[PDB]
């Protein structure tokens with residue numbers, strides 16, 4: 587079997603081992619929806635408590651994407667500067683894509699702390715426009731009905747992007763990117779799913795939504811800082827303190 591069919595398998599394996607929540611569990615749990623009383627309970631929480639909860643869930647989700655990245659062929663062989671550049675730009679873009687698996691377009695709910703709730707769950711954060719943007723992005727992805735393997739290959743390409751400003755070894759990233767692009771294109775062809783290519787977000791869209799999200803996270807972190815045990819300290823230090 588070709589270098590490319592092995593690359594498809596290695597990316598899908600890495601994804602399955604780092605996917606954090608099982609799609610089968612997320613789909614089954616769709617009927618499990620926060621009550622009016624449970625929603626009011628969350629809305630009455632202080633923004634500092636809701637921040638602690640959301641910051642920790644987002645940090646944990648990022649750490650799953652760091653593991654994913656570390657398991658991609660060639661990622662660990664990049665200079666550390668380039669590993670940091672790709673993960674700083676890319677890891678939260680991958681979390682925002684991964685969210686569509688935990689999103690129900692039927693009732694516009696996301697899986698959060700054991701049940702499905704709407705964006706009004708997060709009212710205490712005072713972030714309505716940003717959170718509405720994140721829900722809308724997930725709503726856009728949900729219409730693709732991404733397979734686990736499509737999500738794996740697409741999110742590998744979200745990360746392995748030679749056009750990120752700051753790369754020291756651009757040609758090493760291009761070589762990895764070309765192989766992952768071929769793997770993705772090969773797999774869509776093999777599975778009669780080339781139709782999703784025309785429906786993928788414009789790439790400026792994910793970058794710009796991600797930029798707004800992280801900017802807001804950095805403001806909360808400045809006001810009420812959380813600490814975690816860094817999975818990748820050089821990267822952690824490029825964002826935390």
Ligand SMILES: O=C(O)c1ccc(-c2nn(C(=O)c3c(Cl)cccc3C(F)(F)F)c3ccccc23)cc1
Pocket residue numbers: 641642644645648649652673674675676677678800802803804805807812814815816817818819821822825826
């Ligand atoms: O475990 C780690 O090594 C690690 C763990 C997390 C990151 C990482 N956090 N992050 C955030 O936006 C973030 C989050 Cl998710 C929660 C609270 C505060 C923040 C903020 F201060 F950075 F704004 C990112 C964005 C983009 C890329 C990587 C990361 C990086 C490294």
Ligand SMILES: CC(C)CCC[C@@H](C)[C@H]1CC[C@H]2[C@@H]3CC=C4C[C@@H](O)CC[C@]4(C)[C@H]3CC[C@]12C
Pocket residue numbers: 605606607637640643644647681682684685686688696697698708711713716717720799802803806
């Ligand atoms: C401070 C503000 C910006 C926080 C944003 C609030 C909402 C949008 C956040 C808080 C917790 C987040 C979730 C935390 C963990 C996961 C699991 C991951 O596998 C997919 C994304 C998903 C499901 C996140 C989606 C976005 C989320 C629901």
